[PDB]
Design a protein around this ligand. Structure first.
Ligand SMILES: [K+]
Ligand SMILES: [K+]
Ligand SMILES: [K+]
Ligand SMILES: [Mg+2]
Ligand SMILES: [Mg+2]
Ligand SMILES: [Mg+2]
Ligand SMILES: [Mg+2]
Ligand SMILES: [Mg+2]
Ligand SMILES: [Mg+2]
Ligand SMILES: [Mg+2]
Ligand SMILES: [Mg+2]
Ligand SMILES: [Mg+2]
Ligand SMILES: [Mg+2]
Ligand SMILES: [Mg+2]
Ligand SMILES: [Mg+2]
Ligand SMILES: [Mg+2]
Ligand SMILES: [Mg+2]
Ligand SMILES: [Mg+2]
Ligand SMILES: [Mg+2]
Ligand SMILES: [Mg+2]
Ligand SMILES: [Mg+2]
Ligand SMILES: [Mg+2]
Ligand SMILES: [Mg+2]
Ligand SMILES: [Mg+2]
Ligand SMILES: [Mg+2]
Ligand SMILES: [Mg+2]
Ligand SMILES: [Mg+2]
Ligand SMILES: [Mg+2]
Ligand SMILES: [Mg+2]
Ligand SMILES: [Mg+2]
Ligand SMILES: [Mg+2]
Lengths: 125, 175, 175, 49, 205, 97, 110
RNA sequence: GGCCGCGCGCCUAAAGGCGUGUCCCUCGGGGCACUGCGCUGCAACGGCCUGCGGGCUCCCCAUCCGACCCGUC
RNA sequence: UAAGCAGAACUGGCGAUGCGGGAUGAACCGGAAGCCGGGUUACGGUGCCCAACUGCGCGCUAACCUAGAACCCACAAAGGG
RNA sequence: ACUAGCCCCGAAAAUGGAUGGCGCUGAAGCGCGCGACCCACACCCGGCCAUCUGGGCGAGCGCCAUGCCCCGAUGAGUAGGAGGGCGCGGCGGCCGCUGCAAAACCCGGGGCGCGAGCCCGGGCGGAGCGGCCGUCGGUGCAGAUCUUGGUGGUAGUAG
RNA sequence: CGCCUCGACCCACGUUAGGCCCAAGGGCCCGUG
């Protein structure tokens, strides 16, 4: 429907915390790992080095988990799970699960149009 | 720095204010979320203050828009707060327009416009929605060209655009 | 003025031994009153045997120049500490106030002898008639037909708005 | 508040009269010692005794 | 020190009788701010301290050299314009691309080669020797120092500069005749339109 | 000016702005200090309830002094900042408040 | 002289010097700008609040135009000699330092 | 630089605002005041909306500033 | 003899700590810290590198020894003119 | 004659060299002042996240009460401790998906979360898989001259 | 040297213990569409 959220969504950091030295080594993955070496520049927070996540970066409680379309996401797998958003259609949007087939996607997209529930990936498959 | 609510009087407004008890005033749909209804706001936003150097008949240089630098005579300040200006349309080709108080500079040169009628010109006249506009413009210059001819060289002054040249410091110029 | 002259008055705390102690006065040069009282208690402790904890501060008053529009000759007797030892010296100055002479004295000691303000004790200040001046460079300005040119002009714009990085010709200056 | 405001004056003024009278008869009037301080910390909290 | 702010295509500075390090300081700020600077007559720049002090300073600099490969080591330029170029480079972050671009906006010459012989050459007031140095203290000219340490084009610079000054002296005589003609013209044109120019009288200088 | 612009009370160990007189009443009313003028009078004229009034005041959080200092490392009589200035604390309060 | 181009000039030319800086770090949220003719901190106050435009030519066309604009305003003086601090909608690219900026008079108090 | 919750149930006035009675204050004109119930998210205007438009947490490059290789004793 | 040596007393610090200054540096000076916007300071500075005066004012110095130029600190003496 | 400021002599090492460099001589040096300015993650005001402190909410029109709302202060961390979460594989239950295409894998695709991670899109592939509650475990890798396997530069070189 | 598939306006030398000056702090330009 029309999103009920009116407070502007601000992000303290639209940027990922990539694991230190994952650029240097192919086998190191980008998922954050807290450095723990005794001499670590990144652990010791020298300027110019990789940044470390902390609780001060957290987002406003009123706007956290809201998608860019100002709705909050709920993943459905069939029609019955989609019926649960009819009373929350102004605050929640529906995403059809990744493994739901094209036949059932038609049924969920039809029922959500009747109920005025927004489906984020209704044009898929 | 006046304290309007300096005294607990509140009765110089409603002197005969001893009045009786107030009388307080199907949806066909229920919105599923308690949304406070939107009523019109009862706040008066205190209309904008005119710059003290802008007085009726004073000359203005336009600072932006398609008429940037046009030397123009000031007529009136509209209810919305935009100044009413005319070129006049004969000398510099600037028609009757309303301009923001910013984007103009008030010079110290003045013109008498006392015997000029600018009454039908107001915010509604400029509502976004022409032959009669040509007539109104035509009948407002001939009431103003003569007063421009009254002062020597004022006609060629109003028909020239203001510009900054080499070595010109806008923060030192008197205007 | 950087330096001010103060008259500081104090005494030892009235005790049953005396109960009407003697009064002590000093003329001290300081930048404000708090620094004048501290220097007073410094000399009372070292010259008499009364320190601030056993004493009372009675009065503090600033002395002013009688005629700050004439030029006086000012002699100063001082005590200063060098890197190796203590020495006393006599200095002479020309100023419209004795405040200027004391500022001159402190500046000269800092330059010619690298002596800072703490290492200086003003023994005596006075005004000297031009007949009795002792140091040269004070008598040579007692000429009634004093005449000379200005050999260093300091070519500069007046108010820093007229400053430019480049100029079209070299300055002409003469004396 | 009226009483306090008028008490700040006649206290400053009285000290002006007392000092003048002391000079009038040739003496010194000693002002009462200060009873109040305002104290502000000017150094940080590192390396403290 | 900030830039001139004069925002021209290029400023031509007559370097004669300026202090070397004070001139280089101002020019370096101009180049770093985006101005193109052309410095002419770099052979007559002045350095405080006479020839002897300045000459041994260069000789100590001439001592510096990479022991294992001198053509890699410091390059010791002998000309006055390249000496001033290196003095300015020392005041610029020249190993960055910004300082590389800044130093590319500087042109330095000995004498006044064309077309700058017919353009306007300015001066820097706070680099001029007459305002910077006491009249009794020693100093030397850049060309004299350069001549002492290996520069060999001082004679051709001097011969060219004499030829230029002859041509400028003739152009000066012609300009004086045209100025006297101009003053007569403004005198005759003053009465012919005497009434119109009344408003110019109080601001006539 | 210190108590008006930077006045905070201690109510239940909490730092409460003295925006109205009810805060001062509910803090120091039992000592016959009703409003912000009584509080100012008690502090300025050190009275029978200075201990209760002063301790009720949360320590003032002054800004960095506009215009700077001279030398925080030595005394005021040496040309620095530390120590007793006795009247020039008012000039210092002007720039820190 | 018969010239072509702009007929009037209602702006003064500023040059971008850089960023708010110390000896060891820099801040893009404010730029340092030198305005022609402004030589003192005192006469900077006239220009405080005045709108500023940085004009550069991009590589593609956007509205059948190859020129882009970034808008800012003069915020305060910087130092004693007329340099000013300016805030733009987006931080200026460091490549723009040394280039020209246009200082208008659009918000006028006089 | 960040924020957007007085006004009307009397009249006139674009609107800011003015207009009642009482006691006191003097030296011309104000001051402190009547206090009765209710309702109670600041505005104006513009350009644009399928486009060479807007955005981007993605990719590449440029520039300025910052930046020494991790683990270990 | 001394040592960036070896050993004790009180306190602080580094180790366990980033950040601003001392060009650079575990310990020196300032100051300790969630992610940010605006204002102002500390130490230290305002010719360029480098943000901020070639600012206002008085003297001293002339180094034909690489004159001199920031606590710790990166040296200088007796003695001479 | 003595005294003390700056300056000079006294004053010699090995790569070429360092008031940090360029340079500076009514200094851009030394001593002493004045006014402004620059400038830290320090101080002040404001927003947001978390920790801690203190409160409000039933003859309930009443609530993930393990919730929501209000108030104030606070936020460095090796060794170490603890809490709350993320992920892997089973078992007991519950709720589902999939030949109208499951798992795995790939992608300058789009997002959510401070983060561990998660969700979706497009492709490949062709038969299985997931989420929630409880419980259990051979349960999370960058190092160990770590194990096994595969692959580089060296290198079209030594020869 | 040979051979060809945003008005971007402005020229004195020289000296400052000297050549009216005491900064281009000027001058010029329809500067006006
Ligand atoms: K080890
Ligand atoms: K499980
Ligand atoms: K050829
Ligand atoms: Mg994110
Ligand atoms: Mg899928
Ligand atoms: Mg300390
Ligand atoms: Mg600078
Ligand atoms: Mg050679
Ligand atoms: Mg300030
Ligand atoms: Mg300081
Ligand atoms: Mg200390
Ligand atoms: Mg250890
Ligand atoms: Mg360690
Ligand atoms: Mg700030
Ligand atoms: Mg100077
Ligand atoms: Mg050092
Ligand atoms: Mg000796
Ligand atoms: Mg240095
Ligand atoms: Mg905060
Ligand atoms: Mg912590
Ligand atoms: Mg640990
Ligand atoms: Mg790839
Ligand atoms: Mg699984
Ligand atoms: Mg198992
Ligand atoms: Mg295992
Ligand atoms: Mg492995
Ligand atoms: Mg490991
Ligand atoms: Mg190995
Ligand atoms: Mg192997
Ligand atoms: Mg191999
Ligand atoms: Mg071979």
């Amino acid at each position: 429907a029309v999103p009920l959220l009116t407070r502007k969504i601000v992000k303290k950091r639209v940027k990922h915390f990539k694991r230190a030295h994952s650029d240097r080594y192919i086998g190191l993955k980008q998922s954050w790992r807290r450095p723990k070496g005794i001499d670590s520049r990144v652990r010791r927070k020298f300027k110019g080095c990789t940044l470390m996540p902390n609780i001060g970066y957290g987002s406003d409680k009123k706007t956290r988990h809201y998608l860019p379309n100002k709705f909050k996401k709920f993943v459905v797998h069939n029609v019955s799970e989609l019926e649960l958003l009819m009373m929350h259609n102004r605050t929640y949007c529906a995403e059809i699960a990744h493994n739901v087939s094209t036949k059932k996607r038609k049924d969920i997209v039809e029922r959500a149009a009747q109920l005025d529930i927004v489906v984020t990936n209704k044009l898929a498959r | 720095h006046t304290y309007h609510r300096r005294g607990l009087w509140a009765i110089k407004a409603k002197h005969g204010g001893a009045l009786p008890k107030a009388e307080k005033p199907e949806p066909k749909f229920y919105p599923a979320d308690d949304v406070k209804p939107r009523t019109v706001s009862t706040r008066k936003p205190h209309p904008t203050k005119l710059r003290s150097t802008i007085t009726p008949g004073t000359v203005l240089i336009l600072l932006a828009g398609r008429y940037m630098g046009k030397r123009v005579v000031f007529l009136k300040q509209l209810q919305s707060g935009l100044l009413l200006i005319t070129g006049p349309f004969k000398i510099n080709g600037v028609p009757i327009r309303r301009v923001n108080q910013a984007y103009v500079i008030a010079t110290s040169t003045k013109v008498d416009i006392s015997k000029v009628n600018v009454q039908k010109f107001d915010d509604k006249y400029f509502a976004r929605e022409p032959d009669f506009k040509k007539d109104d413009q035509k009948v407002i210059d001939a009431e103003l060209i003569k007063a421009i001819d009254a002062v020597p060289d004022l006609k060629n002054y109003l028909g020239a655009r203001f510009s900054l040249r080499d070595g010109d410091k806008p923060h030192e110029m008197t205007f | 003025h950087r330096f001010h002259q103060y008259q500081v008055v104090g005494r030892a705390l009235p005790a049953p031994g005396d109960e009407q102690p003697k009064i002590y006065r000093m003329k001290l040069w300081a930048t404000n009153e708090v620094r004048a009282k501290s220097k007073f208690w410094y000399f009372l402790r070292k010259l008499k045997k009364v320190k601030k904890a056993n004493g009372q501060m009675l009065a503090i008053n600033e002395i002013f120049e009688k005629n700050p529009t004439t030029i006086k000759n000012y002699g100063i007797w001082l005590r200063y500490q060098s890197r190796t030892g203590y020495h006393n010296m006599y200095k002479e100055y020309r100023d419209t106030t004795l405040n200027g002479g004391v500022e001159q004295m402190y500046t000269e000691m800092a330059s010619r002898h690298r002596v800072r303000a703490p290492c200086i004790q003003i023994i005596k200040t006075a005004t000297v008639d031009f007949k009795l001046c002792k140091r040269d460079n004070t008598k040579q300005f007692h000429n009634s037909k004093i005449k000379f040119p200005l050999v260093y002009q300091k070519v500069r714009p007046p108010t820093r708005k007229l400053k430019t990085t480049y100029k079209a010709t070299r300055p002409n200056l003469f004396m | 508040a009226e009483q306090y405001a008028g008490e700040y004056e006649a206290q400053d003024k009285e000290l002006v009269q007392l000092k003048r009278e002391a000079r009038m008869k040739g003496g010194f009037y000693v002002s009462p010692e200060a009873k109040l301080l305002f104290v502000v910390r000017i150094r940080g909290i590192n390396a403290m005794h | 020190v900030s830039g001139s702010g004069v925002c021209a295509k290029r400023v031509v500075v007559d370097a004669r009788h300026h202090m070397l390090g004070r001139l280089a300081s101002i020019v370096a700020k101009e180049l770093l701010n985006g101005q193109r600077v052309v410095v002419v007559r770099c052979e007559e720049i002045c350095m405080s301290g006479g020839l002897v002090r300045q000459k041994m300073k260069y000789l100590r600099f001439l001592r510096k050299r990479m022991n294992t490969k001198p053509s890699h080591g410091p390059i010791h330029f002998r000309a006055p314009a390249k000496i001033l170029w290196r003095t300015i480079r020392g005041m610029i972050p020249h190993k960055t691309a910004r300082g590389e671009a800044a130093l590319a906006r500087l042109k330095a010459y000995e004498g006044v080669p064309p077309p700058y012989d017919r353009t306007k050459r300015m001066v820097i007031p706070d680099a001029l020797k007459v305002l910077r140095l006491q009249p009794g203290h020693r100093y030397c000219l850049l060309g004299q120092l350069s001549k002492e340490v290996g520069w060999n084009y001082a004679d051709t610079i001097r011969e060219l500069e004499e030829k230029r000054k002859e041509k400028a002296k003739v152009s000066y005589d012609r300009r004086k005749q045209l100025a006297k003609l101009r003053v007569k013209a403004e005198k005759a044109a003053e009465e012919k339109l005497g009434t119109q120019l009344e408003i110019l009288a109080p601001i006539k200088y | 000016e210190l108590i008006y612009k930077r006045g905070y009370g201690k109510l239940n160990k909490q730092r409460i702005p003295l925006a109205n007189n009810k805060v001062i009443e509910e803090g120091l009313g039992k000592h016959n200090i009703i409003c912000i003028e009584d509080l100012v009078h008690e502090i300025l004229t050190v009275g029978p309830h200075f201990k209760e009034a002063n301790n009720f005041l949360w320590p003032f959080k002054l800004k960095a002094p506009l215009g700077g200092l001279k030398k925080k490392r030595n005394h005021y009589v040496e040309g620095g900042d530390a120590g007793n200035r006795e009247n020039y604390i008012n000039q210092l309060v002007r720039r820190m408040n | 002289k018969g010239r072509q181009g702009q007929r009037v000039r209602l702006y003064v030319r500023g040059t971008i010097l850089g960023y708010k800086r110390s000896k060891s770090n820099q801040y893009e949220n404010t730029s340092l700008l030198q305005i022609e003719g402004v030589n003192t901190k005192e006469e900077v106050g006239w220009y405080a609040g005045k709108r500023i435009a940085y004009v550069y030519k991009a590589k593609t066309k956007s509205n059948d135009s190859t020129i882009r604009c970034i808008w800012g305003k003069v915020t305060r003086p910087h130092g004693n000699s007329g340099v000013v601090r300016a805030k733009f909608r987006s931080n200026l690219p460091p490549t723009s330092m040394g280039k020209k900026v246009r200082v208008f008079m659009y918000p006028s108090s006089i």
